[PDB]
Design an enzyme around this catalytic site. Structure first.
Site, short mmCIF file in Angstrom:
data_model
loop_
_atom_site.label_atom_id
_atom_site.label_comp_id
_atom_site.label_asym_id
_atom_site.label_seq_id
_atom_site.Cartn_x
_atom_site.Cartn_y
_atom_site.Cartn_z
N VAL F 84 2.29 2.58 1.81
CA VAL F 84 0.90 2.96 1.57
C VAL F 84 0.11 1.73 1.14
CG1 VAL F 84 -0.67 4.44 0.28
CG2 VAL F 84 1.61 5.29 0.91
N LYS F 85 -0.95 1.43 1.89
CA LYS F 85 -1.85 0.33 1.57
C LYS F 85 -2.92 0.81 0.60
CE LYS F 85 -2.82 -2.50 4.98
NZ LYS F 85 -3.48 -2.97 6.20
#
Lengths: 220, 220, 220, 220, 220, 220, 220, 220, 220
Positions: F84-85
């Site tokens: 997850v960015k």
């Protein structure tokens, strides 16, 4: 310093000519092709877009020295302040020598190495245009090539200038300017990036807010 | 910058003289021997090939200073303005001093070290020729030798020039030019490699294609 | 260190196998062609010249990944200890991946840039061969390319080795060894220049003279 | 660190053996010739002078590999644990390989270049001896050669040592030790200069004077 | 790190032993002379001043190796944790070797050069003491000498330490510590300068004022 | 090394997955928007284009930490190997801490300075993605930013990797790889440029011609 | 550049005056003693050997400034073009000042440090002679001393020249010339090593063989 | 170069004035105090010790600008060639401006940082005196401070000179001179160390012995 | 050098104008707002505080080029020696060109990058103000930006000056001055830090005490 745009977009030149202190416009066969306007129309249009001044560059298409000289004459007939771009090849070097003898100013183009570029200056070219991004793109070091080229001209052909070309990012153009290049030609996107900044915009917004806070207006 | 070819190939000189801005042609005994043509024929043929101008260099063969002076006279009788190459040996240094007094220009050749090269300049040589590749090939550092020699001449004999010689790759010649050498002599193969490029050729092909796509021809 | 010769000259390999500690022989399509002997004859002849040992390299000719895999199998069927050279192109990288899966060792060849080289290692090549002199010859910096490539392999693919290739002078090969290349392939001319020196010859002559002076023979 | 003397002066070795921590004595043909004593006498006398221990080095005189191997046997019969010095030539490399197979330790001598030196280590030499001053004297850079050689051995043949040789000044030997050479051989004059100092002598005089002033004697 | 004071001032040692983490005290003949107290009294007094611990150093006065060994025994009889300082001279090196064989720890003193210092380590000295300020005072580069010495020990005698000595300014001592010296001996004036600062004193005064301003007291 | 493509172009990923050794694909909100396919369709499609393997990256869109954690869980549920960015903002850092405690892997994105990047790693991010070209474009030094970030991670958070992103030229990506970045994500144009070369193409042509010359075919 | 020989060997000066471009000869008390010939005979003999020209240097022997001035006048009475060498001591500096007032040119000799050297220039010496090898031999860095001295003269006394002296190897003298010394004095052995080289000799042999091969003689 | 002594010791100045080429003498309040002689006596005495010439420096004692100007006028009246030292404080800078307008030459003293020093030059000081050893002693880098100060003056106030002061070792003073300082003031101890050398003394002894050996006397 | 204060604090300017050699005062919208005094009152007050001399700088508030020209004239109407600060934006650059034509001096402000800054100089700005600390605070390298800008002006626009601005610490300002900026504007706190120092205060206190001890007073 001579700041050029590398474009056939006449309207964009007009727009930016009131922003930047432009020396003129450079073209190459691809740029001319993209605009779909022949040089006999494009070059006077660019002249007008600049405010009826500036220096233009346009490239020969012929593959023999004799043919390149013929092209050069055709180009110089289109408009007064015109430097002829000659690819730095075997025939191109021969053409550059002939054009020197005839008093037609040249730029040595399609330069991918420092020695090749220096040879075009020695042959008579007033400008030498390394293709910075193309050298970067093909696994070389475009900025190193520019540094070497500029060193060669400074040492060996000091009346000739580097006209750095072929950019995908401002950092490339900055690095060319720091290396001492006395002329540069920017694509429109990179040119605009130099003068677009979120940090600058934010600084201005904050100044406005502070001013409004103190004086109840956003003006002097 | 003075750009020389290092060759006895008269036909190749004539061909390249219209491409490069040549200052002239250098020879040495092995180069003359390769072409099988005696000096009294070769040197006038070279002078002609250049267009009846340029500076020629040829080397003495004698091993005593007095003999070398006699050779110098013989060479100058063949080409009145030729520069005489003298190996920088004990007797060669003695000859260079004698030739200075007599007013015959010399080049100090077969230089494998900077101090040796400097001594030839101090004795009167107008040019000093390090053998770059020969130093490289024998386990030294040719480019470092050139950098040192150039520094010595700049400091201690600034009227003398480095004429860098002996090349197997363009990179060696480039490095010498970056080091500030004010003259260089290229073998035919290296000279041609400077102005031969797959990248340059592809760029021109692409320019032609783009032009044709827009305008239906590859002529201006 | 693995020291290779880059040749199809069987007799010269036999001669030099006695002198150098050779790891084997590398070939490329031009080298094979120059020797006139097809691979099914050449590769066994080389094996014998090496003393019935060593590692051989030969290059695929096909232009599709499937065709390159077919070539690799053919090449492996000629010789046991054979590493297949694959050009680092779009289809070459595809072939290197397939050959890794099949357990056929590869070398990524025709490398003109460090990133290109690194990609071949990541795809499975055990060796990566930059063309040092070809990069030098075309106006780049072959040694800088090698330094970058070696850095990339050390950082990102340490199981892969640089096999530095393409040399016109000992200095280039020296500089590649100093850069940390763990394998190298030399042409015959450069290999022999490493081990023949006027300075060394002169030292041994002086030793012999001094020995003769004291003891009245030149033997122990 | 292994510290050697480079000498045939038996009496000087005996004297200095109680001063320095000597690893042994190196000879070469000129050094042996200078002392006018044949090897079969000299080498046992050196072994004795060292205290019946230490490592001796002596050089072959033959010019063929087979001859050099015969010399090596003869030398080892004189001193059973001696290290055989072999010039790093074409035939010398061949001999070093043969002697590796036979289990006779070698030193690769008369090294004027780093790559030449590395090749001797790869062929089997346990030591490599660059001729530092000889490279310096002939217009090269001896210390740079040593730095390169040391780098090559560290990278590519780490079981082999540099035995730096050929010195006219302490500074050369110091620089070699700073470069990481794991063995060195000093001529008598340089060795003594390391441990001779006006500054040191004056310091001791001053200490004595100060002691006497306080305590009326220069004894503890 | 071993921090020593270079003094015969017993009261000053006692004072500073509760401030600094001292490893002990070093003396030399001049320092001993200045205090006008013989070693058989001084050394136990220093031992007491340190809190009945620490390592002491004292120097031989004899000029022959045999005499120096006799001195060393006398010194070691005075107190247990005692390292013998031996000047690094011809006789001093011989003594250091003898003392190694006998198991008496030594320091090589009066070192004015890196090679001289390294020799004393190789001979058996556990510590090597360059005279930094004396080298500076006499027109050399004391810090460079230390850097070179430390490099030599690291490379060639890693069980030996540099004990840097002879200081007129904190910067010299700092520079020795940054070079990696694992022990140092400070004169009292320089030691005290390390822990005397107008900037520090002012910072503390300001903290006190701020505290008083907020809380009406200068205490927690 | 982990090599990613930075794209939402499924067909392009399928094509290049057989060429490059991909670790997976990165997306950002703009890249997803350009593809006009929602993530719940795009992420499985990319997974399949990679061959039903690899690691995918997608960015949260919420502006509160609590919102971002909710986004994270949602993304993780779409496909297994999903990092997850999270933008490295005030709320982003808070979210990265929370996601560390939950055991959801994160990448700290929109990094324009080294200290900002480091903070995201300290908060728990496995990757940190500097926007190299964006820093370059806005008048900074992207590569210097990467060098500093890499230095900070190596010193202070060695479990975290740089994932260099945002490229207009191969040289930028190369310089990141040389700086030590252990992961990188390339746009399609730059990826393709790595493995497109006029020099390589010309080398292969020449091989083919030479082979044909000798053997009368272009196959092995 | 002024090139001197450092010798009392009259016949060797005559021999070498023909070869080198000599400015003159330097002497010191040891050099004079070695030659056995008192100055009133030596200095005229040297003058003649030089060809009745050149500049000679000779050193005072007295230990007081007044005595040194008396020596200077005596020395000047032997030879017109004579520069008096004065040791840079307390009384030497006093003498240099007095000699400046009297208009007798001086050289400040026995310089072992840059500051000492600079002081002699400021006091009026036209030349300053660092003892390069003596500094090297005593554990310093003679070339670093020369670099510093030259810097001091360039900055602070630019009318004064370094006359670098005391050499055991060409490299030392080379390094002094590279440092910018405007004058140098060479011992005979080093001077001759500059201009005799196995590499150069071999090149000239090869030229002769190739010439003979083509033309059937070794003469022009 | 202007070389000063930093002292109130009249007899010492008289002695050294015949040795060094002094420009004059500097004082400060502590140095004046140590001599216990008021300035109205000291300054004429120093003038006479110098030979009735040279430039003297003395420091104001007032703490207001107006007070300092009064001090300045008083000092100027005592002796002609007198430069007034003003501490570079708030009031000191104010006084330096006022003294510029009056045409009284000043030196900005008690400089512990480059910017402080520069400000004094901009305000009108002809000299700026960094306290090199004091910066060193308090845990800073005096020489770096001098390098930066010199750089600032060269760039921004080139009419002003650095007058480097405060020395415990020759190396500090040398390093200031190498940094380009155009004036310097030495304490007596450091001054004397410049021209005291065991190496020089030993060189002169050896000369004397060699001369005696050959000629039977120690005079010319 | 032109030294400015960056303030709207009239009383502080008056105080500091007698201490520093001020060129004038700079303002920006935030600094003006902070003082709560409109430009029509502030700017004449600042003029008076400087002593009725010096140069003031004030910023336009308008966002169009035409509006910025109107503001420029408004500002010039308030104060004679006033330089108009124009943000270096698209419209700003257009305004700078217009103001150059009209002969109204400008400064290019809100500069966050070197190329942006250079463009403003090329457009006609006599000064260019990089926001040093703002660049530092946003994760860039403010000093490197200044170095790059100064290089660009020196090379390409030498008539224009850098006016370094935006400081939180003296070190930043010092580094700008070292970089060769020919003008600078300091906030009050940084300005006062340059000229207030515990080390300097302590020095002056010790001077006073020594003088007291000798002369029983603290005054001349």
């Amino acid at each position: 310093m001579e700041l050029y745009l590398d474009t056939s977009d006449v309207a964009a030149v007009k727009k930016l000519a009131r922003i930047f202190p432009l020396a003129g416009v450079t073209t190459n066969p691809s740029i001319v092709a993209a605009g779909k306007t022949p040089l006999d129309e494009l070059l006077p249009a660019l002249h007008d877009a600049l405010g009826g001044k500036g220096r233009l560059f346009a490239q020969v298409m012929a593959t023999t020295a004799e043919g390149m000289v013929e092209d050069a004459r055709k180009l110089r007939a289109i408009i007064n302040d015109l430097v002829v771009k000659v690819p730095v090849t075997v025939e191109g070097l021969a053409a550059i020598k002939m054009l020197k003898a005839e008093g037609i100013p040249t730029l040595g183009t399609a330069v991918y190495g420092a020695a090749q570029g220096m040879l075009s200056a020695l042959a008579g070219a007033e400008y030498v245009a390394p293709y910075v991004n193309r050298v970067d793109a093909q696994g070389g070091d475009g900025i190193q090539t520019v540094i070497e080229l500029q060193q060669l001209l400074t040492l060996h052909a000091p009346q000739s200038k580097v006209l750095a070309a072929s950019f995908k990012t401002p950092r490339q153009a900055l690095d060319c300017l720091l290396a001492g290049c006395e002329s540069i030609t920017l694509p429109l996107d990179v040119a605009q990036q130099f003068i677009t900044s979120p940090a600058v915009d934010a600084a201005i917004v904050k100044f406005e807010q502070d001013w409004q806070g103190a004086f109840g207006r956003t003006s002097i």
